[PDB]
A paper describes a structure:
The MhGgH monomer displays an (α/α)6-barrel domain typical of glycoside hydrolase family 63 (GH63), to which MhGgH belongs. While the active site of GH63 members acting on larger substrates is located in an open, solvent-accessible cleft, those of MhGgH and of MgH from T. thermophilus are covered by a cap domain (subdivided into A′- and B′-regions) with constrained access through a narrow negatively charged tunnel. The crystallographic structure of MhGgH revealed a homotetrameric architecture, which is compatible with the oligomeric organization of the enzyme in solution as assessed by SAXS.
To avoid substrate hydrolysis during crystallization or soaking, three catalytically inactive variants of MhGgH were produced. Two putative catalytic residues (Asp182 and Glu419) and one substrate-interacting residue (Asp43) were identified and replaced by alanine to produce the D43A, D182A and E419A variants. The thermal stability of the D182A and E419A variants was comparable to that of wild-type MhGgH, while that of the D43A variant was slightly lowered (3°C) [Fig. 2(d)]. There is residual electron density compatible with presence of the substrates in the structures of the D182A and E419A variants, but not in that of the D43A variant, independent of the soaking time, highlighting the contribution of Asp43 to substrate binding.
Author numbering:
A (entry chain A), B (entry chain A), C (entry chain B), D (entry chain B): 2 to 446
The structure:
């Protein structure tokens, strides 16, 4: 027909329909077939999407994730659904059940972590619950009573075990932990990953998404899977990873998210009278990781750089992660204006060929840009949501509104795509992606 | 908080969330616990609610119902879910699998029928599909190819087997077939039902809805269950029911719905080039049942009367079924103006104590009125939807709009109640009622 | 930027801002500069646009128009604003104040008429007023008390003086009376208009709209002005016009509007207890003009034809006026289905190059089609509104809704254009056109 | 009827209709009859309401106000419409044209000032203009070119002449300059104002608002008018006012607005490349007045106090002005949490009897509270708007959203009242108040 777009009520209805369709009972899959398990930072965004629909079920999603938390406080990036195949690497390949002393009992999980967006989801649940009356507030408050300690142990694990030199940046041992699997950010670190005798495997992801231009290459997957072998060889021991891992990077976007999450969780702790020692620690980490992000920044543009710990070199790339300081604050006034100018100008949101005024995952003017290839170019609704929410929290009400308006216009086809081609708007990756529906529901719920 | 109501997008999202939550896979329950099976006219309204969400799944709902159609064309009023308890009378009590020569193989069903709203759901599916493009139109058109014959056999069974004297009104052998179980319409016919040796039973419905003021009495249930015994004794044989049934009424509201449904299905048959003989028969029945409804009407107010076939007497009651002629048309101009005056005045929608400008199931000024008791007074969103849709089809655009606006205001608490107290707006009956969510979604989808 | 469209709330605000900006006090101009006076059928649409904003001011608009009614009941098509120039032909050219015995005192008007959409405006005012409470209902009821007789005299002058032979169609003496000045409908009748010594003149309309492709030609204006000379020569006397006018046509679209308007006014008359004889006359005229419209129609396609009274021949053209019978009803069932098939097919709303699913003023496949030239092709929001309102009144709820949706999409640029290029959507004619803002306000009010 | 509320589109339409109706040509009256002139801070809010409708007309509103700026930079609080009477005190009473050396030529104005919300209006105009494309941006940029210097002179006159001692707070010589004429804030200072021989007068305000409970008392008006006599006696000379005025107070709410406005104007200055010295002065003033506001605050609760310069004492009252520090920032973290707890608790937004979750002008638990009496208790939409905008700018997105939602709920009756009874929601003061329509338009525009 003359316009395939849905009205706001039709789109909200379809988004909620999707999220309930991806519910296995106590966990929501990240997508129906491509990602048929619970991913950690996806579960946070799913809980945000569920909060306008059912505070009780949003709380269940976070409870299920936190029940898979490791003994040392790490939240693993995948919690596998029982008896579910069609995703590789599955639990057999990770072997955390047999090898990892800290793995949970009676959950199957991966052995790496992912960004700490969870406190943001807790804030959204509390904000919805407070509009819904007493029994709903009681549900959310009982969740805090039950899980405050687990959330603290999660933030403490990050601060103590992935920032062992108190530099205020999080070290990753796998690009998957960044959430941006094949970002140009990691190319030079991955070039220093040399697989040994890698056990044979067959990919599953590109059986579902068959267009090779939309997913990482076989050579990249070989490196992803080899890092798993290096972790397995030391039984996922935190104390041994710095000595054996071929990939060790400080992720400045993860670090900025953690700064925000600490500040958010500290404000929740004050509001709900959690222990003062915990609130103090959270504000201290918020400050430390804010400073750690600012320390990376370009002196002209304010752009944030990742750091290769093995090579001891700043990683300079032109991706959306450069805008990490906008999330957590801390740049001097003049440099933050330069960074906003970069965000809005012809290298990113202002590029003249963009269909929507949204942030591409890699700058279209970078030689690394590929308009279809996962994190090397496409526009991701999940990132649009996170930037809009963080911008509103900075006080940039109009910038946040414009991102939401363009993100809703992009989503109004109802495909709920994982990511979109930046110039044509073609939906790419998995359709029926839960956190894309969640973004739409929060923007409308 | 200061206002518990939801915005239109929040309400649409919650309605879709509910309908997906009630999906068992290929059938949607009418409610989560009170009605944990598929009801026939509920399934039509569920398909209307699904159409803005998934034309494919809306079609599946009707396919599942039609797969339970009896050999003689009857659509039974319940299709039981496999292995589901907590509803009485269940399939053991009906014993149609063992006793009824016309019962379907490999579905379990009841042995009575319910109103033919199904063609209306087919129209809504086609209207949505035509806005959605080629592959979606193909899905809806393939449904017509597959099920046109079954829909014809359903309408033919009603016309030939429940109007055996071609009076243009449908005979019922159970008040449950009217959809209005305990309506005052049936009280005098039920007083002539005398149970014999009624096999012991324990109700299940009032274990879920425990407030006795909201459900029928034990004495009424004894009569409902005795009629089942009379049908079982003749093995549900259509030819034997007139000779043995203690309850035989002509239902003028069912008759008007059938008139509309025949006209709707005839227009679909013309549009999609179905056999001309079928379209002709449908228009003939549309006309016959329109005239049959008009024949019942009060010469002053236009109000339609049911007919007790055993007592040979017009049943004069003050319920929403009086407005049957407004659905199908056919009254002379002056009498239809009088009937609209009755609808809008102080006996119904204009009653000064009503919270919303909606049609109570029984007039608040009738001595039969009970403000909590199922069909004896409460406002039913399903009836608001049906009247609004039929009124729009009469060309009464503003009257239809006002019913929709008030029905949405009533529903904006998000309880999706089965029915509502007419004066206080208190939600009553089952919460999470699928056809209440469907009404909201159609009004917004 | 990326999306120059307005939200529904922004668009409704800017539509109301425009209408109040075109208010001279007691009359609203049809456009700020091109049409700086009150046009008769524009005033009806303006009152519809004002009814959601102020029932009182909506009533004032019709009061002002009726205060300019001629002594014989004719509503003239222009009521000039005092002292305003820049429109031609102005009141000096018409000279009705000096020549026309029936012209109003102390108003200046044109000497021809225009379609009777006024009763539709009265219906919308009453519907709004009934939602606004006792004081607002009193305003609208006082208007009926004060103006019912003038409305009757208007309808009676059309029925008796423009249908002298009781054929059930309205005769026009000028194409301006049709509202479709340069429609292909009138080309063969204008070809027989041979101007004599025409007093010199300078056009004003193409000083404001300078693009010559958007307005009638100079040769066309010469014929328009020559017909004025013929009417002036007989002092605008109804009895003498049939003997002298070079242009005499029966307008089937005007006739169908009149049928609808008579039926609408009759129902208002019944509801507000107006004299029985008036109501009976209105129903008589509604039927007469419904039959008159049907008599013009092609027996296979249903398309309605105009009639050239001087040439005694049916005018066969491919414009939107062919769909006149859809407005008033009366066609046999098969013929109306055929006419709907024409409307929805590739000659009109289904043409593959149309930007919107809307009714072009002339079929894009006609040899007469010109995509920019006034009534020879462009899409007119005022027609979209009239068709969608009449369709909803026929019971065609989905058809009406689709026209409304597409009309709002087209209007969402906020130009409030007089008409739009059918392929590109370019706004054409005057911007800030009052009845385009009124359509938008009604569709959202 | 059952729901006298308007839909968002109807409400936006009626708000725009009202604003255009209050337009005299180049100035908008604050209300049709009670306030038939241009008020200074009302004009800022009016320009905000016009920006979604016409950036050009929004700019004209500020141009007209600035054309009335005094020679020393003061923006007077009233610009009188030519020839308009029915407001008292009018221009003959002020006699600024004859007495005040700095009064404008060929404009008539008052002789006192009002809060500097103008920069906020400029920000909203620019944000709208940037969404509307090149021509509209040029309009708004031309305004900056033409008026940047006048805006600087306005801020510099406040900073240098109303903060002579560089305390970072604005001194007022009349309670009218606060915008909160009869606030309890000023009661102890007015108690020391002893009128001498006051030239006789007749109030006009209580001929329009006759209910005495809604307006200030006669004794209060005598003091207001006596202060005028004191200013006239010294010819409105800035240098002489501190020696003669019986009323001299530092207004912490005005001061916080000024801080915000300086920061807003500085950011505009940086974005549009205005002189570096101006931007540096604006940042200096923003900090000075932020610190000045913080210096007034209770160390436990954060509540800000006004200061009586003549009595040399802090004015401790329980009004909405206590929340001044929330607008401008600067409080220590613990103190701001305490102040938010006061705002949200049972003394203000959390009071159990409030109809809406909105900020009453005086705490309902204060002995000074009067639920109908102007600034002594009622809820003012203009304050709701200002607080919600400032809160969003602080990053408090949910707090801002809740105020907007409740303000729209309250405004959904369409009265556009000046203020509302806090318990019953009764509209009070003038109906058709321009800045109430502006708030609604901004919240929906």
């Amino acid at each position: 027909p003359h316009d395939p777009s849905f009205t706001p009520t039709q789109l909200a209805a379809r988004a909620a329909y999707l999220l309930r369709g991806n519910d296995l009972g106590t966990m929501t899959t990240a997508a129906p077939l491509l990602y048929p398990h619970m991913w950690s930072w996806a579960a946070a965004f799913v809980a945000i999407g569920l909060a306008p629909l059912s505070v009780e079920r949003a709380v269940v999603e976070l409870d299920t994730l936190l029940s898979a938390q490791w003994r040392n406080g790490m939240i693993p990036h995948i919690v596998f659904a029982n008896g579910v195949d069609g995703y590789f690497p599955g639990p057999a390949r990770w072997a955390t059940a047999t090898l990892a002393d800290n793995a949970p009992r009676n959950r199957l999980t991966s052995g790496i972590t992912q960004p700490p967006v969870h406190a943001i989801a807790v804030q959204r649940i509390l904000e919805h619950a407070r509009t819904r009356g007493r029994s709903t507030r009681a549900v959310a408050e009982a969740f805090l009573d039950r899980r405050w300690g687990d959330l603290m142990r999660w933030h403490r694990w990050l601060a103590e075990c992935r920032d062992r030199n108190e530099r205020g940046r999080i070290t990753l041992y796998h690009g998957w932990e960044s959430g941006m699997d094949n970002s140009p950010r990691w190319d030079s670190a991955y070039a220093n990953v040399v697989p040994g005798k890698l056990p044979e495997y067959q990919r599953a992801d590109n059986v579902i998404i068959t267009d090779p231009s939309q997913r990482p290459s076989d050579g990249e997957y070989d490196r992803y899977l080899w890092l798993l072998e290096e972790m397995k060889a030391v039984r996922y021991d935190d104390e041994r990873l710095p000595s054996v891992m071929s990939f060790q990077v400080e992720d400045v976007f993860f670090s900025a998210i953690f700064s925000v999450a600490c500040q958010v969780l500290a404000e929740i702790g004050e509001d709900y009278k959690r222990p003062h020692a915990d609130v103090k620690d959270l504000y201290l980490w918020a400050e430390r990781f804010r400073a750690g992000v600012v320390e990376t920044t370009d002196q002209r543009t304010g752009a944030a750089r990742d750091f290769d710990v093995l090579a001891e070199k700043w990683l300079v790339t032109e991706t959306a992660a450069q805008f990490a300081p906008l999330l957590c604050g801390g740049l001097p006034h003049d440099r933050e204006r330069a960074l906003l100018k970069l965000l809005e100008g012809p290298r990113f949101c202002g590029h003249p060929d963009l269909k929507y005024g949204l942030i591409p995952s890699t700058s279209p003017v970078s030689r690394d840009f590929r308009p279809r290839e996962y994190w090397r170019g496409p526009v991701w609704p999940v990132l649009t949501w996170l930037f809009s929410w963080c911008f509103a929290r900075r006080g940039w009400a109009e910038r946040a509104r414009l991102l939401r308006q363009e993100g809703l216009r992009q989503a109004s086809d109802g495909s709920f795509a994982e990511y979109y081609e930046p110039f044509t708007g073609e939906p790419l990756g998995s359709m029926q992606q839960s956190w894309t529906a969640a973004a739409v529901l929060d923007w409308l719920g």
